[PDB]
From a paper:
Titin is a protein expressed in the skeletal and cardiac, or striated, muscle of vertebrates that plays various roles in muscle structure and function. Encoded by the gene TTN, titin spans half a sarcomere (the basic contractile unit of muscle) and has various functions including preventing sarcomere over-extension (Gautel and Djinović-Carugo, 2016), acting as a molecular ruler for thick filament formation and as a hub for numerous signalling molecules (Kruger and Linke, 2011, Linke and Hamdani, 2014). Fn3 domains are only found in the A-band region of titin, where they are arranged with Ig domains in a pattern termed super-repeats, which themselves are repeated. Fn3 domains have a characteristic beta sandwich fold, with a core of hydrophobic residues as the “filling” between two beta sheets that pack against each other face-to-face.
Fn3-3 and Fn3-11 are found in the non-repetitive region of A-band titin near the tip of the thick filament, Fn3-20 is in the second D-zone super-repeat and Fn3-49, Fn3-56, Fn3-85 and Fn3-90 are located in the 1st, 2nd, 6th and 7th C-zone super-repeats, respectively. Fn3-20 is at position 6 of the D-zone super-repeat, and Fn3-49, Fn3-56, Fn3-85 and Fn3-90 are at the 11th, 10th, 6th and 2nd position of the C-zone super-repeat, respectively. The variant in Fn3-20, Leu18237Pro, was identified in a patient also carrying two C-terminal truncating variants inherited in trans, whilst Val22232Glu in Fn3-49 was co-inherited in trans with a truncating variant in the kinase domain at the A-band / M−band junction. Conversely, Fn3-49 Val22232Glu and Fn3-90 Gly27849Val were insolubly expressed in bacteria and following attempts to refold the protein after purification from the insoluble fraction, were shown to be unfolded by 1D NMR. The crystal structures of the WT Fn3-20, Fn3-49 and Fn3-90 domains help rationalize these observations. Mutation to glutamic acid would introduce a charged sidechain into the core of the domain, which likely renders correct folding of the domain impossible. We see no evidence for dimerization in the crystal structures of the C-zone Fn3 domains determined here (Fn3-49, Fn3-56, Fn3-85 and Fn3-90), agreeing with these findings, and our crystal structures of Fn3 domains in the D-zone and at the end of the thick filament suggest the same organisation of titin Fn3 domains will also be found here.
Residue numbers in the entry: 2 to 104
């Protein structure tokens, strides 16, 4: 008997550019009894209700991802799913709203 994994641990922004935001997280506390196969990153405009998927899970084995194609001076929010062969974790929201900016 196997379940979807738990939420990714400690998600954060760790870099930005004027057109991208880079997120990092840690492996979930539990994997539901089947190995983690990937992660799924979703991004929305902070002033929006429409989340957009940024990648295919099997394409994202590492616990970091650069979200590209973002508009400078526009605020975004992010959430990350852990995935295994059973399904998707509860998403782990990335705290706060974030601008893509040259820092």
């Amino acid at each position: 008997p196997q379940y979807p994994p738990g939420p990714p641990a400690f998600p954060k922004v760790y870099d930005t550019t004027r057109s991208s935001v880079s997120l990092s997280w840690g492996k979930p506390a539990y994997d539901g009894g089947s190995p983690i196969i990937g992660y799924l990153v979703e991004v929305k405009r902070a002033d929006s209700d429409n989340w957009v998927r940024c990648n295919l899970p099997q394409n994202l084995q590492k616990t970091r991802f650069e979200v590209t194609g973002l508009m400078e001076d526009t605020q975004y929010q992010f959430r990350v799913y852990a995935v295994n062969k059973i399904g998707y974790s509860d998403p782990s929201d990335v705290p706060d709203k974030h601008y893509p900016k040259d820092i």
